Amino acid sequence: SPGIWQLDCTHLEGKVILVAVHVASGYIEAEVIPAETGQETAYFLLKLAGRWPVKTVHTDNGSNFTSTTVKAACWWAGIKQEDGIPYNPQSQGVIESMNKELKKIIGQVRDQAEHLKTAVQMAVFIHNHKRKGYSAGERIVDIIATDIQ
Amino acid sequence: SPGIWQLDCTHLEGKVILVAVHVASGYIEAEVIPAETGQETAYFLLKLAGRWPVKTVHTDNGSNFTSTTVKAACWWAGIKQEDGIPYNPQSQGVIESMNKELKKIIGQVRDQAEHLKTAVQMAVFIHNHKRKGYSAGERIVDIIATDIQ
């Protein structure tokens, strides 16, 4: 479905990378944060929903599902907050693979960037433009445009 | 035209708000930054281009046009860096009006947000969802989807 996103939190070095995946397309947005708190997650969701039509978010863990600050942001931005339980078991594997791919790209750009946050945004760029042949960026626009029409 | 963005820097309180406008649609992304440096602008452009197909950027001033760090980010992300001279004089007025609208929304949400950065992202959300009747968010997706097809 065009409005469904999944939250994904992965760790690298001693730092936290928060990722939102548009499920139907594989398109992502991502940020480096000092730690995964309710407040950080809330702010990330607010940014995402202002930029794409976020209808449903599958949260990455129970703490963010429970967080009153995350719930407030979801209320504010008109997002249905749901769990991220992989009722289809292949969901876990897809997310795992993406985290590996992302860390691999981060490794490939580390001669070019002084800070992790730059490397992560380089990885977002490369991931979203990668032709698999359409790109994830092409797919999300097509999916949403078709829905509007 | 589907790939053309314009940078816009506005000030509020004693802080700096950096805005990118998708010219054809009026869709925006925005960030609060401590000061408008080449490095801050470069990083903002990298984020933007990883998220939307940014072909051309009209920079907001001569310092960012000249900045080697901004030029490096534009090279990295495949962006043609151009000036932002309003050869069509109605360009200035449109940007001015948007800055006013954005500050107005920021004012309207200030009871809800402790930090300016939250208020700015609330303003991004409201601006992009506002029906004028299609929204800016609807228009950018339609424009880009039509271009891909």
Ligand SMILES: O=C(O)CNC(=O)c1cccc2c1OCO2
């Ligand atoms: O991916 C490509 O080659 C072309 N890009 C796009 O059409 C695109 C569309 C939406 C979002 C994006 C995009 O790219 C990055 O984030």
Ligand SMILES: O=C(O)CNC(=O)c1cccc2c1OCO2
């Ligand atoms: O704007 C609305 O009412 C519906 N939203 C959209 O189709 C939309 C599409 C793309 C980007 C967006 C969007 O919204 C915010 O950033």
